[model samples]
Target: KTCEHLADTYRGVCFTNASCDDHCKNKAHLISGTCHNWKCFCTQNC
Candidate 1:
């Protein structure tokens, strides 16, 4: 799997990986996500 930027999930600066992961699933409808450099990144099969 590879990680890509999550643009539409959450707004503003990212803080928690758990929230990022949740937003990716809840909003972006993706499998998983993580926070890096105060931004959200999503991971899926590639």
Candidate 2:
């Protein structure tokens, strides 16, 4: 999978990975994400 195009899932402090994923998923019409250093980073397929 070409998951190179990555960006922050949200603009606020993400408490957990789940929350981050939720935010990213909902915000980006659902994809996949991970929380690191109080931020959520998501990978895009396109």
Candidate 3:
């Protein structure tokens, strides 16, 4: 699985961790993600 705010980017930068998590979750239609280097990346569970 993959998670990102934009498909062309390696990381999904965000203003907040919650926002990042939500963004990945909403996009993936599953709940699993976290902020890494100020960006959001989908977890294995996603």
Candidate 4:
């Protein structure tokens, strides 16, 4: 299963998916990250 959530630890407007992915993996401990409307959203195994 997949779970998606807002990346609370991400700071400022999101530009790159790569940066968001790193923050999501490191800070949020998620599997993937995506930028939507300048915000970071993270996904993980559930």
Candidate 5:
């Protein structure tokens, strides 16, 4: 997904620019920067 879409989801979970970062570099396109502990940190948003 695109960053814009990911950012939207990130915001719903009470996350802001503060928690954004490049994660799972190997799967960058498939993964967003808003995940944590193997699960999406923005669980509430998802």
Candidate 6:
């Protein structure tokens, strides 16, 4: 099967306030305290 170009999934301190459960299913890692969504900035693990 082929996969689609979906949004990024941030899994780190920068996504503590992100509602991933309602949008994303895959988990992503943080790079330089930043995630895919540059808006959902956090300081603790989500």
Cα deviation at 44, candidate 1, in Å, is 1.8
lDDT per residue as tens, model 4, 23-43: 888878767888888888888
Candidate 2 Cα misplacement greater than 4 A, ranges = 4-11
Best by lDDT: 4
Off by over 4 Å in 1: 1-3
**Which stretch of 10 consecutive residues in model 2 shows the poorest summed lDDT?**
2-11
List the candidates ranked by lDDT, beginning with the highest. 4, 1, 2, 3, 6, 5
Model 3 C-alpha lDDT versus the unseen true structure: 0.57
Task: Write the residue-wise lDDT of candidate 3 on 1-46 in tens digits.
Answer: 6534432242445676676566666766555666666766665432
| Cα lDDT tens digits for candidate 1, 1-46 | 5657666547768766787888778777778888877778777666
lDDT of 1 at 33: 86
Model 6 error, position 17 (Å): 6.7
Model 1, poorest ten-residue lDDT window?
A: 1-10
Candidate 6, residues 1-46, lDDT tens digits: the string is: 4232334444433444344433343333322222344333322233
The TM-score of candidate 4 is: 0.76
Writing each residue's lDDT as its tens digit, candidate 5 over 1-46 gives 3233333333234244335443222233343345443233321223
Q: What lDDT tens digits, residue by residue, belong to model 2 across residues 1-46?
A: 6453334447677666787677767876557787777777676775
Report residue 33 deviation for candidate 4 (angstroms).
0.5
| Model 4: lDDT of residue 2 | 80
lDDT of 2: 0.66
Inter-residue clash pairs, candidate 6: 13-44
| Per-prediction CA RMSD (Å) | 1.9, 2.6, 4.9, 1.4, 9.7, 11.1
- For residue 28, model 1's alpha carbon misses the true position, in angstroms, by 1.8
Model 4 alpha-carbon miss at residue 41, Å: 0.8
